Amino acid sequence: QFAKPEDAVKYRQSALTLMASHFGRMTPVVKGQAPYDAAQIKANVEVLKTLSALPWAAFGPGTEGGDARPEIWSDAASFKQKQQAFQDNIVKLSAAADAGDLDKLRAAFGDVGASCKACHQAYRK
Amino acid sequence: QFAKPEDAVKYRQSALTLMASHFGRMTPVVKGQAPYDAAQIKANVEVLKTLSALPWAAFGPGTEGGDARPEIWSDAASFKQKQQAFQDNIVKLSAAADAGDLDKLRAAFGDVGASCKACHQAYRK
Numbered sequence: 001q002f003a004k005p006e007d008a009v010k011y012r013q014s015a016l017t018l019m020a021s022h023f024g025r026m027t028p029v030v031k032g033q034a035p036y037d038a039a040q041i042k043a044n045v046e047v048l049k050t051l052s053a054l055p056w057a058a059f060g061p062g063t064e065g066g067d068a069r070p071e072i073w074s075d076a077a078s079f080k081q082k083q084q085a086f087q088d089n090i091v092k093l094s095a096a097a098d099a100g101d102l103d104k105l106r107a108a109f110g111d112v113g114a115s116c117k118a119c120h121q122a123y124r125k
Numbered sequence: 126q127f128a129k130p131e132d133a134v135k136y137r138q139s140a141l142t143l144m145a146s147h148f149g150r151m152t153p154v155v156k157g158q159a160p161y162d163a164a165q166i167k168a169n170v171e172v173l174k175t176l177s178a179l180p181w182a183a184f185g186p187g188t189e190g191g192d193a194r195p196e197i198w199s200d201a202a203s204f205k206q207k208q209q210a211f212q213d214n215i216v217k218l219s220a221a222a223d224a225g226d227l228d229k230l231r232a233a234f235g236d237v238g239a240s241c242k243a244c245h246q247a248y249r250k
């Protein structure tokens with residue numbers, strides 16, 4: 001859907017920005033600094049699950065650019081594993097949110113964050 | 126969810142970028158320049174419906190900035206009407222996509238685009 005590689009870069013940066021807001025806005029909740037409303041979090045995690053499926057299709061071959069490392073492309077199977085593993089961490093977060101289980105939410109949130117940090121150290125300049 | 130007004134600006138710009146890609150990538154399909162796969166479009170419009178609910182909460186009071194006109198805030202009921210009417214145009218697009226009805230898709234797509242253009246002329250610098 002991208003006329004030029006720059007358009008893919010702009011898309012994925014935007015998707016990642018949104019994905020980061022939907023994740024990070026729950027930090028006060030997980031820490032107990034903000035109240036836990038199970039319905040609120042269930043709805044937010046549904047938004048996060050949609051967003052978390054979006055960036056990866058905008059790292060197609062030849063879309064080198066932005067803050068992305070060139071290792072994203074040469075090691076296609078491995079980058080894929082990190083994005084697929086991140087989404088299966090998101091599936092666990094959804095399950096926790098759907099259950100309205102704060103303790104399960106906190107644990108799943110920590111796992112998701114670790115997956116963010118890993119892919120970052122690895123595939124972000 | 127925004128530490129400073131700039132963070133709201135960045136969020137809404139990103140949401141609007143995503144929303145624009147999910148809408149505009151269907152243009153070749155509506156024009157017949159690309160094939161119509163009803164399942165593909167149904168899934169894409171589901172993504173667009175999620176995205177189309179996101180920008181508006183990032184125009185909260187005091188988040189003046191970006192390319193947004195100051196009329197977004199002083200006329201809160203009217204801006205609201207344009208975003209609510211845009212989303213009800215998206216509901217009609219979803220219905221068309223869910224029905225797998227190309228003619229209904231084209232008509233709904235045109236209505237959505239007109240709603241984009243209107244709010245733009247009005248509330249974008």
Ligand code: HEC
Pocket residue numbers: 009012013014016017019020023065066067068069079082083086112113115116117119120123124
């Ligand atoms: C790889 C499988 C990643 C996972 C999982 C996550 N991110 Fe990441 N992120 C990744 C790359 C390769 C890039 C650079 C994209 C580019 O072309 O520039 C990024 C970027 C971000 C950004 C900055 C976006 C921008 O506006 O430019 C943020 C804020 C970000 N990523 C956050 C983030 C969070 C919180 C994640 C988990 C919820 C996460 N990312 C996962 C690669 C990957």
Ligand code: HEC
Pocket residue numbers: 134137138139141142144145148190191192193194204207208211237238240241242244245248249
């Ligand atoms: C008001 C109710 C709007 C509707 C409906 C749509 N858009 Fe819009 N858009 C609007 C504003 C006020 C702004 C400026 C935001 C800012 O603070 O800068 C925008 C911006 C865009 C952008 C640019 C985003 C960026 O990266 O900076 C695009 C590409 C865009 N809008 C597209 C667009 C499309 C295609 C729409 C319908 C599917 C649409 N917008 C609706 C206000 C409103």
